[PDB]
Design an enzyme around this catalytic site. Structure first.
Site, PDB file in Angstrom:
ATOM      1  N   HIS A  47       0.807  -1.219   0.000  1.00  0.00           N
ATOM      2  CA  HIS A  47       0.000   0.000   0.000  1.00  0.00           C
ATOM      3  C   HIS A  47       0.831   1.256   0.000  1.00  0.00           C
ATOM      4  O   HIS A  47       1.888   1.300   0.609  1.00  0.00           O
ATOM      5  CB  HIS A  47      -0.897   0.061   1.251  1.00  0.00           C
ATOM      6  CG  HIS A  47      -1.707  -1.186   1.447  1.00  0.00           C
ATOM      7  ND1 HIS A  47      -1.621  -1.950   2.589  1.00  0.00           N
ATOM      8  CD2 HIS A  47      -2.574  -1.825   0.626  1.00  0.00           C
ATOM      9  CE1 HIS A  47      -2.437  -2.994   2.484  1.00  0.00           C
ATOM     10  NE2 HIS A  47      -2.999  -2.963   1.287  1.00  0.00           N
ATOM     11  N   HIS A  49       0.882   4.717   1.779  1.00  0.00           N
ATOM     12  CA  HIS A  49       0.305   5.346   2.966  1.00  0.00           C
ATOM     13  C   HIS A  49       0.502   6.876   2.847  1.00  0.00           C
ATOM     14  O   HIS A  49       1.358   7.348   2.052  1.00  0.00           O
ATOM     15  CB  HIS A  49       1.048   4.778   4.218  1.00  0.00           C
ATOM     16  CG  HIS A  49       0.643   3.377   4.553  1.00  0.00           C
ATOM     17  ND1 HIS A  49      -0.035   3.065   5.705  1.00  0.00           N
ATOM     18  CD2 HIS A  49       0.801   2.208   3.874  1.00  0.00           C
ATOM     19  CE1 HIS A  49      -0.212   1.751   5.769  1.00  0.00           C
ATOM     20  NE2 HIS A  49       0.262   1.211   4.651  1.00  0.00           N
ATOM     21  N   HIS A  72     -11.620   0.911   2.093  1.00  0.00           N
ATOM     22  CA  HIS A  72     -10.548   0.056   1.577  1.00  0.00           C
ATOM     23  C   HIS A  72     -11.085  -0.964   0.550  1.00  0.00           C
ATOM     24  O   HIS A  72     -12.169  -1.550   0.754  1.00  0.00           O
ATOM     25  CB  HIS A  72      -9.856  -0.687   2.745  1.00  0.00           C
ATOM     26  CG  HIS A  72      -8.750  -1.609   2.293  1.00  0.00           C
ATOM     27  ND1 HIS A  72      -7.522  -1.151   1.875  1.00  0.00           N
ATOM     28  CD2 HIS A  72      -8.721  -2.952   2.117  1.00  0.00           C
ATOM     29  CE1 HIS A  72      -6.776  -2.169   1.481  1.00  0.00           C
ATOM     30  NE2 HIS A  72      -7.476  -3.274   1.654  1.00  0.00           N
ATOM     31  N   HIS A  81      -9.131   2.878  -1.648  1.00  0.00           N
ATOM     32  CA  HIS A  81      -8.240   4.022  -1.393  1.00  0.00           C
ATOM     33  C   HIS A  81      -7.353   4.221  -2.611  1.00  0.00           C
ATOM     34  O   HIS A  81      -7.008   3.255  -3.296  1.00  0.00           O
ATOM     35  CB  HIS A  81      -7.376   3.726  -0.159  1.00  0.00           C
ATOM     36  CG  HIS A  81      -8.166   3.436   1.105  1.00  0.00           C
ATOM     37  ND1 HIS A  81      -7.716   2.576   2.072  1.00  0.00           N
ATOM     38  CD2 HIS A  81      -9.358   3.911   1.559  1.00  0.00           C
ATOM     39  CE1 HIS A  81      -8.567   2.551   3.094  1.00  0.00           C
ATOM     40  NE2 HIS A  81      -9.566   3.368   2.809  1.00  0.00           N
ATOM     41  N   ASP A  84      -4.433   1.767  -2.479  1.00  0.00           N
ATOM     42  CA  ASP A  84      -4.737   0.323  -2.402  1.00  0.00           C
ATOM     43  C   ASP A  84      -4.171  -0.428  -3.605  1.00  0.00           C
ATOM     44  O   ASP A  84      -4.873  -0.650  -4.606  1.00  0.00           O
ATOM     45  CB  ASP A  84      -6.274   0.102  -2.305  1.00  0.00           C
ATOM     46  CG  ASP A  84      -6.794   0.434  -0.935  1.00  0.00           C
ATOM     47  OD1 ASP A  84      -5.957   0.617   0.009  1.00  0.00           O
ATOM     48  OD2 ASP A  84      -8.022   0.549  -0.763  1.00  0.00           O
ATOM     49  N   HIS A 121       3.301  -5.213   3.925  1.00  0.00           N
ATOM     50  CA  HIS A 121       2.721  -5.666   5.211  1.00  0.00           C
ATOM     51  C   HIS A 121       2.976  -7.124   5.512  1.00  0.00           C
ATOM     52  O   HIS A 121       3.347  -7.900   4.637  1.00  0.00           O
ATOM     53  CB  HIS A 121       1.210  -5.412   5.208  1.00  0.00           C
ATOM     54  CG  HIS A 121       0.871  -3.962   5.295  1.00  0.00           C
ATOM     55  ND1 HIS A 121       0.559  -3.362   6.492  1.00  0.00           N
ATOM     56  CD2 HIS A 121       0.846  -2.976   4.361  1.00  0.00           C
ATOM     57  CE1 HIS A 121       0.274  -2.085   6.297  1.00  0.00           C
ATOM     58  NE2 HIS A 121       0.465  -1.816   5.011  1.00  0.00           N
ATOM     59  N   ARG A 144       3.547  -3.521   9.599  1.00  0.00           N
ATOM     60  CA  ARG A 144       4.335  -2.949   8.496  1.00  0.00           C
ATOM     61  C   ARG A 144       5.722  -3.551   8.557  1.00  0.00           C
ATOM     62  O   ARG A 144       6.492  -3.310   9.534  1.00  0.00           O
ATOM     63  CB  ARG A 144       4.376  -1.442   8.708  1.00  0.00           C
ATOM     64  CG  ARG A 144       2.921  -0.944   8.784  1.00  0.00           C
ATOM     65  CD  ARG A 144       2.803   0.526   9.153  1.00  0.00           C
ATOM     66  NE  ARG A 144       1.389   0.912   9.242  1.00  0.00           N
ATOM     67  CZ  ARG A 144       0.896   2.151   9.157  1.00  0.00           C
ATOM     68  NH1 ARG A 144       1.676   3.202   8.890  1.00  0.00           N
ATOM     69  NH2 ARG A 144      -0.431   2.340   9.238  1.00  0.00           N
TER      70      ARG A 144
HETATM   71 ZN   LIG Z   1      -6.667   0.841   1.804  1.00  0.00          ZN
END
Ligand SMILES: [Zn+2]
Ligand SMILES: Oc1ccc([C@@H](O)CNCc2ccc3ccccc3c2)cc1O
Ligand SMILES: [Zn+2]
Lengths: 154, 155
Positions: A47, A49, A72, A81, A84, A121, A144
């Site tokens: 992802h 961020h 999400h 997002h 995403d 992740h 993370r």
């Molecule tokens: Zn997301």
């Protein structure tokens, strides 16, 4: 206008890599490719961020980049997002040879990801299909493992 | 015109490390730059924004000083300077530079935007273009790159 970007992913453990971003046209899709090593075999949430802030490690990068305040989802979803990008898959040697093309992230404009943080992740992203609140926020992808600020590249 | 804050975590192969903050309350106003960098030898150290936010070869892949106007190297107060020419920072006898700079040439938005580029603290003083050799009007003779980081959007 930037047509290329790069991110060096590092964390507290063994996970590390380099991910490249290329965008032919500011209208068009971004190609995302590179290699991450040190991962457990299988799927890992991947992802962008919101903040390019590594002052407290990956935690300070904040939530998924979501300037449209959507829920999400996976990268193929209309409801997702901007950050995403779904999952990446590590092979039995712990290596993810990432290759994604995405039309929602950009290297310019409102959806620009330059200066934000890429994070890989601990677990699979469930793509918003897990039937709980956390699925509609983070995809249940867990901790993370490694991250970096996305920078302008030559 | 939207980022008002940015942050950069500096790291390198030696002991030099720091956190630098950037704040620009008005898109057409100055950027405040402040923070602390430890592990430095006492005295002046060149402090510059380099063109690429590419750390794949550590600080070396950041390329030259960010210079979209194709000028010669100068100090921040010079008309003739790179956009990335932030001058020197001074480390005290305990190895700490408590950085405090305000600059009107860098920005956190538009064409002089330094988001996504690389901040580097250098081995020696930047001579600000006044060293009488060609390296002086390119890099200021500040020598090697001790630590660097990509400048990121902050909350
Ligand atoms: Zn997301
Ligand atoms: O959406 C896009 C798709 C493709 C492009 C091309 O310019 C970039 N092509 C990517 C490329 C280039 C070299 C590679 C080498 C090894 C592995 C993967 C590699 C992917 C732009 C795009 O914007
Ligand atoms: Zn310069």
């Amino acid at each position: 206008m930037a047509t290329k970007a790069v991110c060096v992913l590092k964390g507290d453990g063994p996970v590390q890599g380099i991910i490249n971003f290329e965008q032919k046209e500011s209208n068009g899709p971004v190609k995302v490719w590179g290699s991450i090593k040190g991962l457990t075999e299988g799927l890992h949430g991947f992802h962008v961020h919101e903040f390019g802030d590594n002052t407290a490690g990956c935690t300070s990068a904040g939530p998924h980049f979501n300037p449209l305040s959507r829920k999400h989802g996976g990268p193929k979803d209309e409801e997702r997002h901007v950050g995403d990008l779904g999952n990446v898959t590590a092979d039995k040697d712990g290596v993810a040879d990432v290759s994604i093309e995405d039309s929602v992230i950009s290297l310019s404009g409102d959806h620009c990801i330059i200066g934000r943080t890429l994070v890989v992740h601990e677990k699979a992203d469930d793509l918003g299909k897990g039937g709980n609140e956390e699925s509609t926020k983070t995809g249940n992808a867990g901790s993370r493992l490694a991250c970096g600020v996305i920078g302008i590249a030559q």
